[PDB]
Amino acid sequence: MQTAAISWGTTPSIRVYTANGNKITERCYDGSNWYTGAFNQAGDNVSATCWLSGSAVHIRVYATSGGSTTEWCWDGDGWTRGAYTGL
Amino acid sequence: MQTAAISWGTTPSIRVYTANGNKITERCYDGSNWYTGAFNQAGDNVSATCWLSGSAVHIRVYATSGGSTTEWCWDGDGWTRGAYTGL
Amino acid sequence: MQTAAISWGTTPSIRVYTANGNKITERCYDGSNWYTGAFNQAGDNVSATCWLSGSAVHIRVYATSGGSTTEWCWDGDGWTRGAYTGL
Numbered sequence: 001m002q003t004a005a006i007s008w009g010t011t012p013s014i015r016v017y018t019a020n021g022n023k024i025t026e027r028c029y030d031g032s033n034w035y036t037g038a039f040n041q042a043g044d045n046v047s048a049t050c051w052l053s054g055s056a057v058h059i060r061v062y063a064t065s066g067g068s069t070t071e072w073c074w075d076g077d078g079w080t081r082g083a084y085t086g087l
Numbered sequence: 088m089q090t091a092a093i094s095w096g097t098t099p100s101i102r103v104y105t106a107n108g109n110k111i112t113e114r115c116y117d118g119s120n121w122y123t124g125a126f127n128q129a130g131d132n133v134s135a136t137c138w139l140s141g142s143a144v145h146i147r148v149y150a151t152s153g154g155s156t157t158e159w160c161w162d163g164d165g166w167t168r169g170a171y172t173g174l
Numbered sequence: 175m176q177t178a179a180i181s182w183g184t185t186p187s188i189r190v191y192t193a194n195g196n197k198i199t200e201r202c203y204d205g206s207n208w209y210t211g212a213f214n215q216a217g218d219n220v221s222a223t224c225w226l227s228g229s230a231v232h233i234r235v236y237a238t239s240g241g242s243t244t245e246w247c248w249d250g251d252g253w254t255r256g257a258y259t260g261l
């Protein structure tokens with residue numbers, strides 16, 4: 001069981017990604033009860049980062065399953081695969 | 088051994104959490120030399136995030152031991168157990 | 175395999191550090207294609223953080239091999255070894 005944590009804004013919002021049992025899930029704080037978010041992808045290891053633009057939060061989550069890392073992107077309109085490729 | 092690193096401000100301040108065995112400890116930098124910080128909790132994995140607000144630094148450390156993640160909170164007055172629960 | 179991710183600026187720039195076996199490498203995004211970065215050091219675990227000073231982006235990468243964590247620093251002019259020592 002392994003986590004990654006990000007936050008933004010002054011509320012703040014927090015996201016905690018947990019890799020366990022080959023899956024990565026997402027717990028979210030937006031100022032009230034913690035909740036389970038829409039992020040759900042395969043992986044045994046996770047990292048994440050985020051930034052703000054004028055009218056969106058952008059999240060990049062790096063999900064590693066074995067020898068391959070997949071980037072997952074939030075830009076306000078659902079989770080989409082990113083263009084990241086490894087070395 | 089596994090680490091998590093955060094930073095804030097212009098100086099900057101940096102905090103590095105290290106899980107070794109089932110203990111997490113904290114090394115700190117505030118602009119001079121590194122020192123050992125007040126954080127000390129159980130865990131074999133760690134992540135962390137931080138933000139500035141309200142004339143304070145807020146840090147959240149997510150410490151996983153025994154299949155369970157505990158959130159530990161610094162808001163200027165000691166490390167306190169947070170509301171976070173997992174999936 | 176295990177990763178750490180950081181980001182800055184509006185573009186944004188992203189760096190993803192991957193520990194595979196006992197080597198840490200870096201992939202970079204600055205608004206067009208991903209490319210392989212200058213960072214290359216020993217380690218079985220990586221974390222990272224960054225900040226903007228007025229005049230440059232600063233990155234700190236914490237590379238652990240065994241019971242020892244080394245800090246590597248980017249301050250605009252190559253990677254240098256940081257003062258960080260462990261507990």
Ligand SMILES: CC(=O)N[C@H]1[C@H](O[C@@H]2[C@@H](O)[C@@H](O)O[C@H](CO)[C@@H]2O)O[C@H](CO)[C@@H](O)[C@@H]1O[C@@H]1O[C@H](CO)[C@H](O)[C@H](O)[C@H]1O[C@@H]1O[C@@H](C)[C@@H](O)[C@@H](O)[C@@H]1O
Binds near residue numbers: 139142162163
């Ligand atoms: C109260 C507090 O958190 N003090 C730390 C201080 O925080 C500042 C905020 O209060 C605020 O003014 O914003 C600025 C940044 O704009 C600071 O974040 O920051 C200084 C460094 O500039 C720290 O040295 C202070 O650290 C705490 O100091 C108190 C003094 O009573 C105690 O010694 C604490 O043990 C010490 O905490 C250390 O830092 C905190 C953030 C945790 O990592 C602790 O585990 C660690 O020991």
Ligand SMILES: CC(=O)N[C@@H]1[C@@H](O[C@@H]2O[C@H](CO)[C@H](O)[C@H](O)[C@H]2O[C@@H]2O[C@@H](C)[C@@H](O)[C@@H](O)[C@@H]2O)[C@H](O)[C@@H](CO)O[C@H]1O
Binds near residue numbers: 028057074
């Ligand atoms: C569009 C957007 O990014 N909205 C953010 C809010 O979170 C999403 O809200 C939509 C409805 O507008 C849904 O409820 C959605 O499930 C929420 O997504 C959650 O947060 C995002 C960032 C991801 O982490 C996702 O996996 C997760 O479920 C959010 O409540 C507020 C907080 O201020 O920000 C909005 O921008």
Ligand SMILES: CC(=O)N[C@@H]1[C@@H](O[C@@H]2O[C@H](CO)[C@H](O)[C@H](O)[C@H]2O[C@@H]2O[C@@H](C)[C@@H](O)[C@@H](O)[C@@H]2O)[C@H](O)[C@@H](CO)O[C@H]1O
Binds near residue numbers: 141145160162169
């Ligand atoms: C939102 C925030 O940062 N608030 C800080 C306080 O933490 C919250 O305090 C209330 C009671 O007043 C509840 O205990 C709540 O659970 C606390 O939330 C904590 O922080 C948020 C961001 C999440 O990480 C959550 O899981 C965690 O429990 C804190 O007590 C005061 C102390 O001065 O500072 C506030 O800024």
Ligand SMILES: CC(=O)N[C@@H]1[C@@H](O[C@@H]2O[C@H](CO)[C@H](O)[C@H](O)[C@H]2O[C@@H]2O[C@@H](C)[C@@H](O)[C@@H](O)[C@@H]2O)[C@H](O)[C@@H](CO)O[C@H]1O
Binds near residue numbers: 210211212213231233
């Ligand atoms: C500071 C910064 O973001 N620079 C970006 C350029 O990156 C550096 O470019 C120089 C040539 O001018 C060198 O190729 C150097 O290796 C590049 O450094 C890269 O970024 C820094 C922050 C580290 O991560 C380092 O290991 C990595 O190689 C970049 O080439 C250009 C165009 O993509 O954009 C600049 O933002």
Ligand SMILES: CC(=O)N[C@@H]1[C@@H](O[C@@H]2O[C@H](CO)[C@H](O)[C@H](O)[C@H]2O[C@@H]2O[C@@H](C)[C@@H](O)[C@@H](O)[C@@H]2O)[C@H](O)[C@@H](CO)O[C@H]1O
Binds near residue numbers: 098234249256258
């Ligand atoms: C005075 C100061 O803060 N200097 C920063 C430069 O790095 C530090 O330089 C001093 C001078 O003795 C020490 O060598 C110090 O250990 C250096 O710190 C480095 O960076 C900090 C943030 C930590 O990561 C530390 O472990 C690391 O060694 C630094 O080169 C410049 C960057 O342009 O910033 C100076 O403020």
Ligand SMILES: C[C@@H]1O[C@@H](O[C@@H]2[C@@H](O)[C@@H](O)[C@@H](CO)O[C@H]2O)[C@@H](O)[C@H](O)[C@@H]1O
Binds near residue numbers: 073082083205
């Ligand atoms: C920050 C990057 O986000 C995505 O890349 C975006 C592209 O998919 C595309 O939307 C162009 C404009 O059309 O903008 C890019 O920023 C990811 O694919 C990429 O890996 C970065 O995370």
